[PDB]
Amino acid sequence: STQYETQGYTINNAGRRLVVDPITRIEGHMRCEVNINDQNVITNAVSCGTMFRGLEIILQGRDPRDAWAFVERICGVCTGVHALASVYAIEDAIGIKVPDNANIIRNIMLATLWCHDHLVHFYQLAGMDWIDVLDALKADPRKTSELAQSLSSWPKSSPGYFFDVQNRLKKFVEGGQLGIFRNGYWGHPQYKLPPEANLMGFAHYLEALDFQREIVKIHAVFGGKNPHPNWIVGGMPCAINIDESGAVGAVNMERLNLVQSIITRTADFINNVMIPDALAIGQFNKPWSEIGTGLSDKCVLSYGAFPDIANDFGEKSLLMPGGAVINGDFNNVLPVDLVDPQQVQEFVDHAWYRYPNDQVGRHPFDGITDPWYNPGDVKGSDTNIQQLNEQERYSWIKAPRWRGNAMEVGPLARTLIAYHKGDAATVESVDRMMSALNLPLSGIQSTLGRILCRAHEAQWAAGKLQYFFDKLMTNLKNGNLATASTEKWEPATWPTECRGVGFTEAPRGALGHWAAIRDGKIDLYQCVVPTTWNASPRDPKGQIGAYEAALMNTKMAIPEQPLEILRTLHSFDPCLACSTH
């Protein structure tokens, strides 16, 4: 057993080793191991991506116009965000400018994804870490109604409703077919909601499971289908026709009416169901404002997103701010440049990849994806990992760093960046939110904080959906219908050799695609994805990533039941297919 110091942590692999494989209520495949000391406190944390597909390899030799369709399939949870990054990257390489309505529609696509993804994460992925579903069976329906009505104007709050929900759960469990509730952590002492709050939460789980299907109808209108809508290089394929013959073959007034109806319902659900539930989880779990801080008080990163001026990716255009904080210095938000080779680099000394020199980090334009399964001594075999060896290579996830710093990305990161750049709406929202909880600002830098920021982002995005729709309708009133630029559609119009970067803020954090085009085909295509940052393994300096750091120093009540580990990991919304691509 060894011990070393990094980022204010003592990494100590003495003591009992705990394995959680598989991590569930995530997308894709993850393994986590920790060591706990005699006080059942985590002294070592090991983040492991247990899948790889190799989209960066598959994309070589493809037509750049096709690339979005391939990379969209990096992930069906954050569906569309890779298509957006791709069309951005190819447009940036070739020098394509899209029409305003294409840009607006793309921002609608992204905001719709934020709303949908954040809502499903809150209920279906993270929720059962905080709601004791089985405890709901002990709730009083009238007391449940009273609680719900004290927290929200949401209509669906009758005692009879809560009784009906409870009775449905009772009949579901009675025969012993507990399905997704089988062998859960129910009764764990870290479950702190009263029974009425569990019944309210569970009811909302079911409402959200129903309601989420409606949100993506926006993607269906503009993008054909969800999951995995369609896009083009040069804008979007959803041609508009309001007032001419054949409007039946295009986005017309009836189609836009559908979109508006979805937007309103989406805002209503998020504002009156998800937001109150998030605050209620805060109220009953305040100690989790001091657990899982990890890198969120040291190093956070946003690239920024939602350019409001078409084809302008600058600071005055992006509605969601970009910037980096390092060394806990939130008074100096630094500018990010994705072309600068000294900024974003990926290391593979602790990952299953070959580099000519594994002691140096490679900017994505110099990226290499050469898979090498080499787990070394894992107390078993190459085909039977009993204990990863975190002193060597232990993951299919590359290790991204920014100026050599290990960074946290995602909703909390973005909230902190916007807050410290002085975004008025963010400042006001955060201050009000932490006031309502009777917690200091610092309480946001936590596992609880990640959940609160995610919910507040769902609300932000629902608001932006309306703003974007209004901008679209304004253009249509002014007779501006264009949805595609085709000046540079034909390969004969492209530079023989060019490269570009497409970036955005996906639901989980900062996303970049780096593409190099040569002779009409993709020569290089490298992706660095938010969960790649967060779930990162260590670097040559032994610096730990956001997940490992957040798990460090965490108390477990019951080592055999990893509820605290699940809470912190789920708070980051892990997407492992994204992380590995």
Binding site: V19, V20, D21, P22, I23, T24, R25, I26, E27, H29, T50, M51, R53, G54, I57, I58, D66, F70, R73, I74, G76, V120, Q124, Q177, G179, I180, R182, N183, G184, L209, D210, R213, V216, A220, V221, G224, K225, N226, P227, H228, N230, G234, M236, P237, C238, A239, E244, G246, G249, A250, V251, P371, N384, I385, Q386, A482, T483, T486, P562, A577
Partner: protein, 263 residues
Amino acid sequence: KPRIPVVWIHGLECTCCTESFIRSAHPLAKDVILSLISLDYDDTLMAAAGTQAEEVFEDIITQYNGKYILAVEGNPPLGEQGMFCISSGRPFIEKLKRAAAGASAIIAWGTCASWGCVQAARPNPTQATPIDKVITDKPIIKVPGCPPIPDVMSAIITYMVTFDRLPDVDRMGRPLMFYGQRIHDKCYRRAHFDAGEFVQSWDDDAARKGYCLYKMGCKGPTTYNACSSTRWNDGVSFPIQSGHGCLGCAENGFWDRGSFYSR
């Protein structure tokens, strides 16, 4: 009255088929889970993780040996001794074979489980392999598409539950009900195809009138699915209706049949 046990496992995948499933409008995925099946194992949605999740997997396949439906999303990679996809420290393929041995039938959700999908596209770095090349002694229903249509997924489930039998299949193991006909055989733009009325570049006058997308690379003529009839997201749209050609996403090898924008 007991509900049919379903075990849903995940190989190499993007989770689009799971996402599609929960989009179901009728029956709602809520009601499928609460009333129609017993979804007894599912990494995406289950409370239990790690050893608790292993305990559920082992108990279900033992207790309901011969009696559970196995749903498979994604595929096994044969590369690196299977360790391109690791579950409980061992190759995913081992979990697939264990689950398959006890299943009464297997549903191969999506192009991944059916054929290979994007990870199997050239040069297939992981040697991703469809389920029917690994499991050769069980009924496999292929439900291809990237992902399949939500209400098609739920319709296949309700068929199996209501009628207590597997859907009848074509020569490739696809349900005849939804894969018997081509996109192009039920496409509302066929009039334009017949008349030689084609979109020639994006957002041209033809595009604004809903003309046929064949010259923009539409693979509808060779693709079997229900997109042009059942449509997507409670009938709201489908790729062609929103102005993009069919990619061919239900067909074996569709990623490697040339550019989506060529003939």
